[PDB]
Design a protein around this ligand. Structure first.
Ligand SMILES: O=C(O)CNC(=O)C(=O)O
Ligand SMILES: [Mg+2]
Ligand code: NI
Ligand SMILES: [Zn+2]
Length: 331
């Protein structure tokens, strides 16, 4: 069995190996990369996402989100307070202001320590979930707006034709902006490219151990757990590495830098934070190996998780027994 300790693997494809996206994912899995839940892909030196980032300041962040925490430093939830619209140039200036800027630090480890000590005492503002792309249309390799769609994968594997679309999303971050513990919708893959700026630190639980994380989360968030049998789908709970280690939960960590891709694999729980002003692009995708995970994915039916249009068909076809309850949660 390849990668039996479930370590995060780092890949360096050549320019030739960068041509066929599906083939390279399958190669990484042949080497056991999925067992970690997360892999890093460093593009060949010949590749570029676009020519420059000099002209992005006029993108609008229609609904910036202020991430307000509650709890203790290692075990907290966050809620998202909506703020007035602002441009990427305005958001960059805000990220760099004395109130929000990254503190002085020695190295990534010192900054990680400072994050976990102090996150709860601040409320950073995240420009998340913005439909759009920063890949040049002429970039033919690993262009996250030109991937094979999940609807086409389902149709190729299962024969059923379904409605829905699959487009990328931009994330503009600042120091301490936080992504809570989650798997993807329908336990899909994700791919994330860090276009510019400061790093993103990731934490991940191997898919084979995801239920250990779920059981801890039920213990640590007991009111939330009573409210919903899949409350991690709400994407609000944080648990620190120190608390994970105290409770014996297997996990790994890695820091993504500008120019690097990360892939999350089906049912790989992940969480993390941004080091300073940055911009990432991400999208969900599927492969043949996903189908069995989609069929078994948990679902939130309490009303909180509310998701895209395109998840309807995935539930309807892969999980017909759950469909009626889940759709009530949507309505
Ligand atoms: O970058 C973020 O805020 C969150 N991203 C993801 O969870 C992802 O790419 O799967
Ligand atoms: Mg612009
Ligand atoms: Ni994710
Ligand atoms: Zn719920």
């Amino acid at each position: 069995a390849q990668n039996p300790n479930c370590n995060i693997m780092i890949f360096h494809p050549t320019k030739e190996e960068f041509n066929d996206f599906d083939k390279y994912i399958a190669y990484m899995e042949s080497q056991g990369a999925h067992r970690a839940g997360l892999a890093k892909i460093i593009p060949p030196k010949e590749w570029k996402a676009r020519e420059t980032y000099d002209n992005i300041s006029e993108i609008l962040i229609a609904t910036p989100l202020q991430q307000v925490a509650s709890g203790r430093a290692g075990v907290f939830t966050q809620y998202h307070k909506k703020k007035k619209a602002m441009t990427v140039g305005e958001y960059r200036h805000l990220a760099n202001s004395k109130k929000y800027q990254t503190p002085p630090h020695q190295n990534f480890e010192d900054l990680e320590r400072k994050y976990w000590k102090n996150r709860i005492y601040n409320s950073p503002i995240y420009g998340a979930d913005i439909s759009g792309s920063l890949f040049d249309e002429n970039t033919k390799q690993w262009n996250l707006g030109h991937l094979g769609t999940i609807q086409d994968l389902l149709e190729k594997e299962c024969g059923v034709v379904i409605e829905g679309v699959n487009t990328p999303y931009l994330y503009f971050g600042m120091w301490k902006t936080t992504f809570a513990w989650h798997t993807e919708d329908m336990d899909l893959y994700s791919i994330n490219y860090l276009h510019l700026g400061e790093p993103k630190t990731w934490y991940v639980v191997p898919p084979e151990h995801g239920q250990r994380l779920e059981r801890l989360a039920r213990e640590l968030f007991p009111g939330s757990s009573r409210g919903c049998g899949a409350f991690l789908r709400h994407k609000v709970a944080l648990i620190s590495p120190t608390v994970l280690k105290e409770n014996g939960i297997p996990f790994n960590r890695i820091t993504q830098e500008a120019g690097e891709f990360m892939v999350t694999f089906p049912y790989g729980y992940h969480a993390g934070f941004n080091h300073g002003f940055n911009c990432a692009e991400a999208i969900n995708f599927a492969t043949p190996r996903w189908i069995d995970y989609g069929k078994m994915a948990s679902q939130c039916s309490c009303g909180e998780a509310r998701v895209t249009f395109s998840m309807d068909a995935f539930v309807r076809i892969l999980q017909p027994e759950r469909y009626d309850l889940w759709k009530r949660g949507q309505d």
